[PDB]
Amino acid sequence: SGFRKMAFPSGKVEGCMVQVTCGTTTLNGLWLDDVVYCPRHVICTSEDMLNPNYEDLLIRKSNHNFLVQAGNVQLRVIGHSMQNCVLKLKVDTANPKTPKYKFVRIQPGQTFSVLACYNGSPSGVYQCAMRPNFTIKGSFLNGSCGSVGFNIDYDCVSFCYMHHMELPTGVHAGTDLEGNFYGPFVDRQTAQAAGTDTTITVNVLAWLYAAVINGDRWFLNRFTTTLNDFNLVAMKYNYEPLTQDHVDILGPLSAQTGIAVLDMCASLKELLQNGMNGRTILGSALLEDEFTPFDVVRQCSGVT
Amino acid sequence: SGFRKMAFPSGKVEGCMVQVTCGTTTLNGLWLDDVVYCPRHVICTSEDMLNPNYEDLLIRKSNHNFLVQAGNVQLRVIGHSMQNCVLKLKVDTANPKTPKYKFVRIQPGQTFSVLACYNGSPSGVYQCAMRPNFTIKGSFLNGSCGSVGFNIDYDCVSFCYMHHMELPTGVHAGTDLEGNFYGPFVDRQTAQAAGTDTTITVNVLAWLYAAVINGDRWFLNRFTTTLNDFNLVAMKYNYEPLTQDHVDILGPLSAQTGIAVLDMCASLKELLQNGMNGRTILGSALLEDEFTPFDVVRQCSGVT
Ligand SMILES: O=C(Cc1cccc(O)c1)NC1(c2cccc(F)c2)CCOCC1
Numbered sequence: 391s392g393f394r395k396m397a398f399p400s401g402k403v404e405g406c407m408v409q410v411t412c413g414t415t416t417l418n419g420l421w422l423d424d425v426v427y428c429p430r431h432v433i434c435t436s437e438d439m440l441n442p443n444y445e446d447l448l449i450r451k452s453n454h455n456f457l458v459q460a461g462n463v464q465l466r467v468i469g470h471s472m473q474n475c476v477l478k479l480k481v482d483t484a485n486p487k488t489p490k491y492k493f494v495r496i497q498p499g500q501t502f503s504v505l506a507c508y509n510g511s512p513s514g515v516y517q518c519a520m521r522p523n524f525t526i527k528g529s530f531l532n533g534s535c536g537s538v539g540f541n542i543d544y545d546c547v548s549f550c551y552m553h554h555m556e557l558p559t560g561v562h563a564g565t566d567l568e569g570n571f572y573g574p575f576v577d578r579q580t581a582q583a584a585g586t587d588t589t590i591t592v593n594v595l596a597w598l599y600a601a602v603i604n605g606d607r608w609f610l611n612r613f614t615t616t617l618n619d620f621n622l623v624a625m626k627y628n629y630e631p632l633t634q635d636h637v638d639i640l641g642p643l644s645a646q647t648g649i650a651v652l653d654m655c656a657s658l659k660e661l662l663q664n665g666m667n668g669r670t671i672l673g674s675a676l677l678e679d680e681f682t683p684f685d686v687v688r689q690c691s692g693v694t
Numbered sequence: 695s696g697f698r699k700m701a702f703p704s705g706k707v708e709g710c711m712v713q714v715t716c717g718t719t720t721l722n723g724l725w726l727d728d729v730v731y732c733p734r735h736v737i738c739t740s741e742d743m744l745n746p747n748y749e750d751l752l753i754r755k756s757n758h759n760f761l762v763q764a765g766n767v768q769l770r771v772i773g774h775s776m777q778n779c780v781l782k783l784k785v786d787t788a789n790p791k792t793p794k795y796k797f798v799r800i801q802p803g804q805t806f807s808v809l810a811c812y813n814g815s816p817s818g819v820y821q822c823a824m825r826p827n828f829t830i831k832g833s834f835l836n837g838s839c840g841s842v843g844f845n846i847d848y849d850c851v852s853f854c855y856m857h858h859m860e861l862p863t864g865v866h867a868g869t870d871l872e873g874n875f876y877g878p879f880v881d882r883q884t885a886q887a888a889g890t891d892t893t894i895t896v897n898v899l900a901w902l903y904a905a906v907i908n909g910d911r912w913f914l915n916r917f918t919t920t921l922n923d924f925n926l927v928a929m930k931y932n933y934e935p936l937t938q939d940h941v942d943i944l945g946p947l948s949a950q951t952g953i954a955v956l957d958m959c960a961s962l963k964e965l966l967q968n969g970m971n972g973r974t975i976l977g978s979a980l981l982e983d984e985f986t987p988f989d990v991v992r993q994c995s996g997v998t
């Protein structure tokens with residue numbers, strides 16, 4: 391037992407990280423088969439980032455202007471194309487460490503692991519959630535651009551995120567691996583504000599279930615509620631509304647703990663209204679919303 | 695910017711994980727060069743665990759009683775020996791994925807990454823600290839035995855922990871890779887209680903520095919203190935006493951933020967005395983003690 395914010399093992403992704411250098415600008419690329427995927431802003435000077443015309447900037451770049459290094463060996467670039475906000479660099483060598491993989495666009499509230507990288511070299515791995523405002527709260531220094539987010543299903547890496555920028559508020563924005571931003575953000579050096587960072591209610595409930603499974607039971611109350619009554623409280627506290635789809639996905643936790651989903655909602659309602667009163671749940675003084683119901687089942691059952 | 699509980703990239707360790715089966719009992723082994731390291735309680739039946747005589751139990755085991763599987767290939771066991779609470783199984787094949795490595799015994803307050811594994815297969819990676827009572831607060835289900843803790847220095851994996859058991863309070867105990875328990879615990883199924891889980895003050899201070907570096911500044915106050923005055927407050931709050939050695943190691947953070955260590959101590963003193971008043975620091979409602987000063991520098995500078 392015990393319950394930890396856990397990332398996927400990163401080895402399969404470590405084997406895919408490369409350094410991409412265009413002009414004097416370097417960041418990370420993802421090498422899968424004979425393609426290297428990186429943020430298109432690799433082509434841009436600091437002056438370019440103010441108001442970049444990526445199509446016009448890219449005209450001035452040839453295959454030989456994209457320097458791709460995997461470990462300390464140079465890959466030969468035989469083609470390049472822009473797909474939305476990512477560049478695809480065709481190389482003459484298939485990555486021999488290519489895992490089974492997919493590109494998936496995730497929904498807000500979904501969690502994934504980030505392999506933070508600098509100059510094509512992995513620095514660390516951490517777990518986060520796509521926020522309801524389509525930002526993530528990462529740990530990214532200058533140079534971490536091209537770092538990717540992923541989930542693993544046995545031997546299949548589903549890549550869901552590529553890091554592109556930090557908003558003036560220090561939160562992070564990026565793309566799926568087709569180069570489409572999450573949310574409304576643009577890869578331009580202009581002030582961009584995020585919407586309301588609401589709490590992922592279905593994830594809090596999953597984590598309350600994990601707490602019960604792990605023996606933190608003090609917050610369980612004598613009450614129940616309804617979806618409509620709960621959602622009145624959710625809205626007041628900038629929690630995402632709970633739907634029957636979210637009730638469905640908490641079923642096995644409901645079943646294991648013999649705690650009806652709406653009873654756990656009524657427990658969460660009192661926690662919102664009363665606070666923690668200086669108490670903790672699974673070592674947290676706040677309600678954790680970066681575990682999905684699938685994450686809680688996975689961790690609580692030991693999937694590899 | 696942004697500040698995350700970050701694990702080392704786990705690939706170098708993933709390449710070392712194997713399954714070890716003795717009698718009907720399976721758990722994880724660490725394959726380095728031509729040796730597999732696993733908890734000695736692999737030899738034990740459920741009845742054996744009540745009061746095991748490992749020397750006597752091991753007499754009944756031959757090399758061919760230790761089944762070592764790496765992926766889906768069987769390694770040939772050509773020797774076995776007990777070193778304290780670990781078994782060393784000599785195999786006829788050097789692990790071709792052996793990283794540069796060392797065995798280190800860490801001190802309380804030191805952080806490391808755990809690669810949680812089941813049946814020799816990695817499930818997840820998370821960061822934790824050796825508690826001052828020589829326990830760790832992990833995420834370990836039955837079968838996670840042999841899972842290891844490590845730090846990485848560029849290309850060198852320093853292995854510091856091997857998971858052996860869960861205490862009745864759901865906290866975790868284990869050994870260094872020489873098989874010596876952290877703390878007073880024994881690999882026997884008998885009720886064992888942990889001492890006071892005190893807060894790692896030097897780590898809280900490092901994390902307060904990380905908060906300042908990342909723009910969470912609200913807790914900075916107009917006060918300073920002395921080591922003796924601070925330590926009076928530390929003791930009252932079950933914080934570890936702060937020494938000049940801990941002051942030394944917070945210097946670069948002191949220097950970067952222009953916040954004298956004793957000023958940050960005076961800020962921590964008020965936080966202890968006043969609480970957070972419903973506010974948060976780097977997304978936490980409690981004071982985080984699982985980042986060392988080295989962790990904070992590493993993350994805040996981007997070492998790979
Ligand atoms: O995100 C930032 C801001 C930033 C820079 C440095 C330190 C910070 O704390 C924040 N700058 C880059 C960027 C800007 C605009 C669109 C875009 F796609 C990428 C360009 C420089 O490389 C990193 C990404």
Ligand SMILES: O=C(Cc1cccc(O)c1)NC1(c2cccc(F)c2)CCOCC1
Pocket residue numbers: 391735743835836837839858859860861880881882883884
């Ligand atoms: O730690 C536990 C207790 C435990 C078992 C199951 C579920 C729990 O939540 C807790 N049992 C094992 C053990 C006991 C004593 C010494 C020792 F070295 C190892 C033996 C069974 O395998 C796992 C380790």
